[PDB]
């Protein structure tokens, strides 16, 4: 697994070389599909290793949702030093996996035949995606996970081929996804940055480090935030704000080159506040007009050395739209709100306009690149600041 483009050129991709993606290091100047829409699709599921079987996870069954939570809680993404692991909650998983248009056959699980234990997963959800001058119905792929005891046995390529087949059956032939590893071939490369909210805890669990020329007392003063936000008229998003949030987001996203195209129903799903999942605040001015909004989702991480201890509480910048409030002010209030709600750290990528505030608001650069990818769509790559899409 190459995490660097230099590593990636010294690697061969036995699976990805067979897929309709551009080759690494080839410069793309065209825009369109690699292969045509298929007018007949394999009806039979791909073959799994002996002893494993496919299943479609109906998350409306609480027991099945808990099985998925447990698979991910124990086997999903860890940080580069294997000290933290994502701890997606069941309620978050419902938010991320049942948006408008979701299909249970696109919650694609692998179970042990004899025990029925869940040991692998991958998911698709539908999304309309604007990529340069084209809008395409696509899927977003997420939650690719193979049990630690099943790794390095070529199960991930089978999971990818099977979700591909199941998406093809529904008439969809493009996808978007992110990954921490370099594959053929990123359409954009983004970097996470981090803003300490509770510096004492971040240093104690070694999420961050004391600068060695700075004391703890000094670090606490440096990152201290006001107790209340400064922007006039900031308040939680409400049902009555759904249309204007939709309108604000649609107009704001036009300036980027890879963006979602959301219906008003999708806007309600992705932004309407749900405690411990998604937070959205709007700025309603002295005229009663909503002019700006900020949003972040809740994604804690298990502290692997102390599974007993409370998870590390992280907020992830989602979509932030400014038309009257300066973005710097909007994000300052996002930090204060996250601190108020008990988060330890606030995370943001360097995409969209985020580079204009990261250093000024005392974010520090993170240790991993997030690559963005399109499947069966060959187009030029773009800089992070033109990426306008944030996944979970």
């Amino acid at each position: 697994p190459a995490k660097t483009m230099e590593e990636a050129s010294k690697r061969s991709y036995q699976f990805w070389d067979t897929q309709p993606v551009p080759k690494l290091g080839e410069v793309v100047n065209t825009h369109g599909p690699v292969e045509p829409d298929k007018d007949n699709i394999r009806q039979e599921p791909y073959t799994l290793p002996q002893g494993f079987t496919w299943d479609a996870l109906d998350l409306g069954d609480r027991g099945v949702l808990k099985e998925l939570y447990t698979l991910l809680n124990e086997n999903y993404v860890e940080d580069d030093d294997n000290m933290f692991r994502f701890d997606y909650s069941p309620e978050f998983l419902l938010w991320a996996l049942r948006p408008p248009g979701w299909l249970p056959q696109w919650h694609c699980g692998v179970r042990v035949v004899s025990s029925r234990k869940l040991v692998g997963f991958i998911s698709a959800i539908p999304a309309n995606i604007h990529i340069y001058d084209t809008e395409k119905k696509m899927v977003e792929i997420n939650f690719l996970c193979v049990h630690k005891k099943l790794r390095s046995k070529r199960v991930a390529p089978v999971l990818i081929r099977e979700i591909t087949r199941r998406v093809h059956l529904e008439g969809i032939f493009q996808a978007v996804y992110t990954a921490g590893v370099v594959l053929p071939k990123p359409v954009g490369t983004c970097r996470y940055w981090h803003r300490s909210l509770n510096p004492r805890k971040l240093i104690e669990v070694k999420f961050s480090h004391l600068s060695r020329n700075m004391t703890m007392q000094r670090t606490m003063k440096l990152y201290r935030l006001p107790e209340t936000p400064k922007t006039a008229g900031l308040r939680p998003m409400e049902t009555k704000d759904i249309p204007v949030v939709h309108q604000l987001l649609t107009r704001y996203l036009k300036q980027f080159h890879l963006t979602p195209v959301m219906s008003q129903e999708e806007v309600e799903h992705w932004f309407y506040p749900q405690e411990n999942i998604i937070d959205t605040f709007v700025v309603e001015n002295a005229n009663g007009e909503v002019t700006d909004f900020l949003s972040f989702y809740t994604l804690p991480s298990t502290i692997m050395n102390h599974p007993t201890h409370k998870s590390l509480k992280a907020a992830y910048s989602f979509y932030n739209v400014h038309t009257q409030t300066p973005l710097l002010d909007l994000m300052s209030d996002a930090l204060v709100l996250a601190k108020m709600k008990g988060f330890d750290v606030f995370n943001a990528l360097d995409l969209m306009e985020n580079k204009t505030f990261l250093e000024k608001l005392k974010f520090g650069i993170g240790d991993g690149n997030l690559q963005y990818y399109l499947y069966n769509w060959k187009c030029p790559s773009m800089g992070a600041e033109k990426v306008g899409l944030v996944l979970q």
């Binding site: 580069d80 997420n142 921490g180 993170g366 991993g368 979970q392």
Partner: peptide, 8 residues
């Protein structure tokens, strides 16, 4: 999927 990053 997402990436779990921390301070460089």
């Amino acid at each position: 999927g997402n990436l779990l990053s921390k301070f460089r």
